[PDB]
Design a protein around this ligand. Structure first.
Ligand SMILES: [Mg+2]
Ligand SMILES: [Mg+2]
Ligand SMILES: [Mg+2]
Ligand SMILES: [Mg+2]
Length: 338
RNA sequence: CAGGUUGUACUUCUUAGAGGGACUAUUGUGCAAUAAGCCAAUGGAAGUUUAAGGCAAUAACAGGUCUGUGAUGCCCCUAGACGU
């Protein structure tokens, strides 16, 4: 037969409120798994986890360092090239630089006016991008000097939900026809692509509902977009008079993240997470909603806690999902079964 | 363990200014017509509209004060005056 059966691995308990952000370490050495996991909750704290080995006691890992910080919620986490630095966006109107090995923040960027909904880290870790309710994207020095702010002509209606930078092809070839950039998605349901120097490259009205998230394929070839639109739209950085592929995932979409290799898209919905495949033309290759850990509280039953974040580990084997109840679940993928 | 210093060092304690924060939130019975809402549990600094107060409608009590008033009507006293 050869089919995808999603075997569970473990759970990470420690977060008070929603788990709004998750990031796993990068491959410090070609194809080596990273033992570093970072999460961000509404509880106002950032989390550095001590990953476990072959665990199944019930958990998969344990809390190593908790970051006392922001005065409010944590909207997103951007991780530095090497697993030792990280930024966090908050509604408190600030951002933070955590030296991941010392629960300290050596730099707080204060300048934002409204809450912040996303932190973008630049390949050449010297450019820090932040999007928030202000409808502005700010550019920061690895110091804290807010440098530039997305003008009016350029910013978009409603607030910004997420901003990312297209990755970077290593070999100094003549790369793709496109040049690295950074796209932003706003609640006005518009996806915009920016020419490094904050100049409009592409602004297409994406959905009708607000867009809660977007993701760029490591290729820096396509972008996945979704929101209350309840539909996931994927775009080709070239012909963009229409989405390179469109799927319908049950309920609203909160997080979309391609596999660091494999070539599937994991979508975070209120149900659970639906994984699709661009290889085929199917419509729901895999699907898990399994959410009920706190739910076993004799009498207290929060049916389906919606997931708030998705993140695979370096290789593309493990998969993490932060949920309502503030609990991260671990899912591995085994095929060739039956 | 007390004492003296010193540092363009720090704020947990103290001060006070900005801003957070609860809204009845999440879960299940009663209500249930849909309801407004009521209950219990959990989380919570905080759930009796959080606690304690301020403000206080229309009428009216012929309530009380002319001894608080240079607010006054009328009536009283006026130089052996109730003036001083
Ligand atoms: Mg009161
Ligand atoms: Mg009165
Ligand atoms: Mg009087
Ligand atoms: Mg006399």
């Amino acid at each position: 037969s050869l089919d995808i059966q999603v075997v569970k691995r473990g759970i990470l308990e420690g977060h008070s409120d929603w788990v709004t952000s998750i990031v796993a370490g990068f491959s410090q050495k070609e194809n080596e798994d990273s033992p570093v996991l970072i999460s961000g909750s509404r509880d106002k704290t950032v989390m550095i986890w001590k990953l476990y080995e072959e665990e199944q006691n019930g958990y998969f890992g344990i809390p190593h360092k908790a970051l006392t910080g922001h005065n409010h919620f944590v909207s997103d986490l951007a991780l530095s090239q090497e697993n030792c630095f990280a930024i966090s966006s908050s509604w408190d109107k600030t951002l933070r630089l955590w030296d991941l090995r010392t629960g300290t923040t050596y730099k707080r960027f204060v300048g934002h006016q409204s809450e912040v909904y996303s932190v973008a880290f630049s390949p050449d870790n010297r450019q820090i991008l932040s999007a928030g309710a202000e409808r502005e994207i700010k550019l920061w020095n690895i110091l804290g000097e807010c440098k530039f702010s997305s003008a009016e002509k350029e910013n978009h209606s409603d607030w910004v939900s997420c901003v990312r930078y297209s990755p970077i092809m290593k070999s100094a070839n003549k790369v793709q026809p496109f040049a690295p950039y950074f796209a932003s998605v706003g609640w006005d349901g518009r996806l915009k692509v920016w020419n490094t120097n904050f100049q409009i490259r592409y602004t297409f009205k994406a959905h009708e509902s607000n867009v809660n998230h977007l993701s760029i394929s490591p290729n820096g070839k396509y972008i996945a977009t979704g929101g209350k639109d309840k539909k996931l739209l994927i775009w080709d950085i070239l012909n963009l008079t229409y989405p390179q592929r469109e799927f319908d995932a049950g309920s609203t979409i909160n997080q979309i993240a391609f596999n660091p290799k494999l070539q599937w898209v994991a979508v975070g919905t209120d149900q659970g997470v639906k994984i699709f495949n661009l290889m085929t033309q199917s419509k729901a290759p895999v699907c898990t909603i399994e959410a009920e850990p706190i739910t076993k509280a004799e009498g207290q039953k929060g049916k389906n806690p919606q997931c708030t974040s998705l993140a695979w580990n370096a290789l593309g084997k493990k998969l993490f999902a932060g949920f309502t109840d503030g609990v991260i679940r671990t899912f591995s993928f085994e095929t060739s079964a039956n």
